Symmetry: C4
Subunit: 254 residues, 4 copies
């Protein structure tokens, strides 16, 4: 039932944000030792678990860019596109709230200790706990290209890993492999834009940080062009290219 699938998409998306935002909070306000690889593998494995939990019900999109691409290139029912997307964004938002609630005290003590004013340009770093912001050395267009390229890779490899007509079927290994895929993308490209690749994963938590005291910088990242636009459209404009490229360059040759 659609209602059951929307619930799964809500829970699955919330689950990966819980693990994801959770580990970044540990790094930022709990002093945990996490390198780029550790942060990336935790996000990836977190995603794998979310897939294992919801694949049997909704098919585990847990990503608006993936839903839209599967609609355009996988015959996914267009009537379920918006219901899935609203569920994904709602789950991400709620999970972000839950993580903030559990780490609550550490956020305030860190801001107090380091004299950080939440909502200021300097608080964007802590806001990074919830969503993505661009590397200091790159601009809007450059950040957009990054998200576009990595999401295309994400979509393309998701199709390849789940395409049973491509080599030996992965079976139950598929979700795990998708998690490791996210891990290598995060390790190789993460320093540039925080490998968002998912509109729900970014906007939901951004809206929460906005409500929790970070204000407008949660959306702009302290940049002239409001940054939230990149994690919103770059992934969509990227998953479509990825899906297209797979069928034309790999599938059409299987």
């Amino acid at each position: 039932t659609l209602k059951g699938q929307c619930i799964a998409e809500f829970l699955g998306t919330g689950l990966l944000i819980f693990f994801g935002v959770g580990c970044v909070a540990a790094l930022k306000v709990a002093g945990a030792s996490f390198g780029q690889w550790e942060i990336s593998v935790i996000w990836g494995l977190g995603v794998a678990m979310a897939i294992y939990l919801t694949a049997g019900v909704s098919g585990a999109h847990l990503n608006p860019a993936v839903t839209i691409a599967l609609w355009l290139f996988a015959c996914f029912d267009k009537r379920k596109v918006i219901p899935f997307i609203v569920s994904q964004v709602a789950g991400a938002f709620c999970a972000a709230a839950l993580v903030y609630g559990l780490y609550y005290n550490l956020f305030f003590d860190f801001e107090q200790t380091h004299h950080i004013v939440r909502g200021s340009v300097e608080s964007v770093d802590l806001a990074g706990t919830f969503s993505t912001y661009p590397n200091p050395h790159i601009n809007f267009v450059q950040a957009f290209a990054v998200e576009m390229v990595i999401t295309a890779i994400l979509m393309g490899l998701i199709l390849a890993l789940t395409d049973d007509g491509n080599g030996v079927p992965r079976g139950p290994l598929a979700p795990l492999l998708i998690g490791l895929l996210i891990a290598v993308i995060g390790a190789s490209m993460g320093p540039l834009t925080g490998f968002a690749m998912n509109p729900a994963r970014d906007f939901g938590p951004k809206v929460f940080a906005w409500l929790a005291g970070w204000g407008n910088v949660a959306f702009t990242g302290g940049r002239d062009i409001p940054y939230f636009l990149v994690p919103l459209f770059g992934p969509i404009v990227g998953a479509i290219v990825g899906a297209f490229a797979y069928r034309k360059l790999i599938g059409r040759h299987l």
Copy 2:
């Protein structure tokens, strides 16, 4: 036979405490370099091995919260609930003793070198080798919510990973995936309460540290409200919610 299952639960629970408490001892008194992720993945993989060793005999609960939840939502024989729980706690206690016995000299030389009085409030850090204690910035109720939420997630995902009617069956991959699940929980939430999620895993070693010279602080953690209560009830009150949530939100939609 029940006697055979209690032996397996004793060994399995002891095995994961051996690996778990062992790596934390290495970190604390042997100067090993371990970040939050490393500590978490070792605990998780340690649990996976314990499952591989005992699943075929007892079903590998190795956790009182899991036993009680499987009794309430999986038709697990109620007559085996207490026998399993006593075996789990006894195994955890013994393994803790074994690890202390192997690292014995390093404990005393570390305390001597750093002028630490075992049993004092400052020795709670070393006591952390055996069991869990709350992050300095959070209190009793906050720590209780953490354990409740993560154990619910643990139970829920354990059911999802072992539910063959949910997507493609994991088969022999299940235990490993459960280990990785524990790893991501430990990495994302571990800095808050040491992701106990298991009454036997915490109480058994706490009782040992109590007997080995840490005294009352082993139970209180140096807090007004005796901390041991959290790792004792939070997990139980959490595994039940998790089990419930799975059947109602995911299973009922498969």
Copy 3:
């Protein structure tokens, strides 16, 4: 179709260079925390994904040394040897360009900040982002022996992991295991020559760095004997030994 296989070899080789060169760029110009193991596992998993993507089409050589060895010991069609090799080198070259394009600004700001003249002997370190260079303490012949030994091991274990007549078939696990194989080679021998083991993986990006401003040092590494020769021939002269050794010492005993 051969055209379809050359496209897959181009994409697959480009994919592993993207992830590989990407993570090294993060380490060198983005300040990411990556140890030898992290760098090695990312390269390995990156290779695994490239295999999953192309195995079903071309068989996933993604390495000139592997193509030549499979031709000499696996009846691989000799008419496809050169088409595969040109595709592999072209894909590696293009991916290197793409990674440089995404990290563009970080390269210049790093060189500016650390007063590094691109093209100078001191810029060889940054050039290391794209390809391999020898450890300061070893010379040409020593570096050649390293690449020869590790590629022989690579080829031999690739055959063993994919040989269904050897123990229990790995099935869909094969690519992942090959990735982990590369990871352990990189961790144990990587500090010596950057575990190139693949002519396309090294020459393509070297030619790019040459064109992007590093000049002649991209090829020589600042050594009397032009270093590029080692990653070019050592792997070939090594994959053949490895393939030979497998059939004679292991296969002939199955």
Copy 4:
């Protein structure tokens, strides 16, 4: 054929020493960043590959303690016990020589730079590249207990992971899981005695270091009681206990 099995045991044992001793050399003389977990996982995965390579031919013992235990509790042909053990020790010795040959220059430059006299008590640290030595805070008997306990665990879990009558068969996952088992043992107990658990893995390289200039300390570790005895007998006296415990406590209940 026995000759073919002895060759596989020689190669397999040599392979894991190559990866193992290789990564420790990187850490000690090549300045690579490796924590206890990284070193442990590399050794483990290295062992997994050695198993994948030789399991189909010899059954992949690659360890005298395992051969002897399988003879006493698995009906392994006693006529092949000594031939296997000589092959294991010879392979370990040769691999150690090969690793030293590839890292040759780094050893001398490190000793020169840090004014270390090879053969002196202070050179035992570098000798640690090849084999195991006890933690400064523990003595002979304590080190013996460690090796005994961990090898018993090793043997017992190897039997459990390969016992198809125990839960869902692992199939091709078995070797990998055994590698991860070694990884968690190394992470939790490695700081105490270098988790030798294998007479061939320790004696062979010790004999090499002895011949390569470390002299008598290679065998004694600079201790009154010659240390080499522990990695020699502790594992044997431990694998037997482990094998026994498995059949009596787990197998007899399947």
